[PDB]
Amino acid sequence: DSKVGGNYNYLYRLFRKSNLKPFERDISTEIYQAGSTPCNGVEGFNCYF
């Protein structure tokens, strides 16, 4: 699973608004809003993929 220049086919979720319950999956890519700063789907200050 390793590659010389890095293997970028593997992903993990870093941002979520709550914790998962047992055996749940979530494959949503809805952009995460941080800092009570409204975000309309755009990466930027306080808005993360």
């Binding site: 319950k21 047992p22 055996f23 749940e24 999956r25 979530d26 494959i27 949503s28």
Partner: protein, 281 residues
């Protein structure tokens, strides 16, 4: 492609008495001639059940109504239907019922049973439907308007082919179908029982226990659900896709489960024949 139906008479929901229904076999264990105490999520006895309709009463002051609202799922759902014509045919379970989150689609469409989990783009007013032909006496399914698109699908299952009895009927309701839906630790548990009836107005009073059927390994969050009803269309029903339809006659009931302790009575053959709701009074 889907359409918003526009001819419904604006009428209130009805409410009824759940009596003693909603019991199911809590485990896959054979027991007999014994009383057993258990704890699970059950429909409380004599609970408040919301009553929805599919019906067409003709006349200027018509009451045509085709109820397919989105209801909360809460901690699990007691669902029951009474019908004569195979109108109530599947459901949708999920959190947004939209393209942004995976959701569960269970549809009993003519000739198969389809279960899919996908990021579906659902119709605001989804339905199935059967057209009655003019040149013969057959009824056929032609309308499948549940979602406009789907992607990122998992857990896809389709049952073996069969023929469906799509013919409309008159008379009292003939088939009572009861289901219990629970969403626990990654699984969607479905319990079921079918009982023959000859009743017209409301849920029959009586007692039965549902069998486990299946336990689906679907890791999704369910907070809302919608019931899918079929429409009847015919050569005698003029109008475009938003008005050229008639509700058939069927009804359904929705209750909610709560943690309860029950005393269940198993008869000599291991059938649950009675029960006591320890929190009723």
């Amino acid at each position: 492609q889907c359409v918003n139906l526009t001819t419904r008479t604006q009428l209130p929901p009805a409410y009824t008495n759940s009596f003693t229904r909603g019991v199911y076999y809590p485990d896959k264990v054979f027991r007999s001639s014994v009383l057993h105490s258990t704890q699970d999520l059950f429909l409380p006895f004599f609970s408040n059940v919301t009553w929805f309709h599919a019906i067409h009463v003709s006349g200027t002051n018509g009451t045509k109504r085709f109820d397919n609202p989105v209801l909360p799922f809460n901690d699990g759902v007691y669902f029951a239907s009474t019908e004569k014509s195979n109108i109530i045919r599947g459901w949708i379970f999920g959190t947004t019922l939209d393209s942004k989150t995976q959701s569960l689609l269970i549809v009993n469409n003519a000739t198969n049973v389809v279960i899919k989990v996908c990021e579906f783009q659902f119709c605001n007013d989804p339905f199935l439907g059967v057209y009655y032909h003019k040149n013969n006496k057959s009824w056929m399914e032609s309308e499948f308007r549940v979602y406009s698109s789907a992607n990122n699908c998992t857990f896809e299952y389709v049952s073996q082919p069969f023929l469906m009895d799509l013919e409309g009927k008159q008379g009292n309701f003939k088939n009572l179908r009861e289901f219990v839906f629970k969403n626990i630790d990654g699984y969607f548990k479905i319990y079921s029982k079918h009982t023959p009836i000859n009743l017209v107005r409301d849920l029959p009073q009586g007692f039965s226990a549902l069998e486990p059927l299946v336990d689906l390994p679907i890791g999704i969050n369910i907070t809302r659900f919608q019931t899918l009803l079929a429409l009847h269309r015919s050569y005698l029903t003029p109008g475009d896709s938003s008005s050229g339809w008639t509700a058939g006659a069927a009804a359904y009931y929705v209750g909610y489960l709560q943690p309860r302790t029950f005393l269940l009575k198993y008869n000599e053959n291991g059938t649950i024949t009675d029960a006591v709701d320890c929190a009723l009074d």
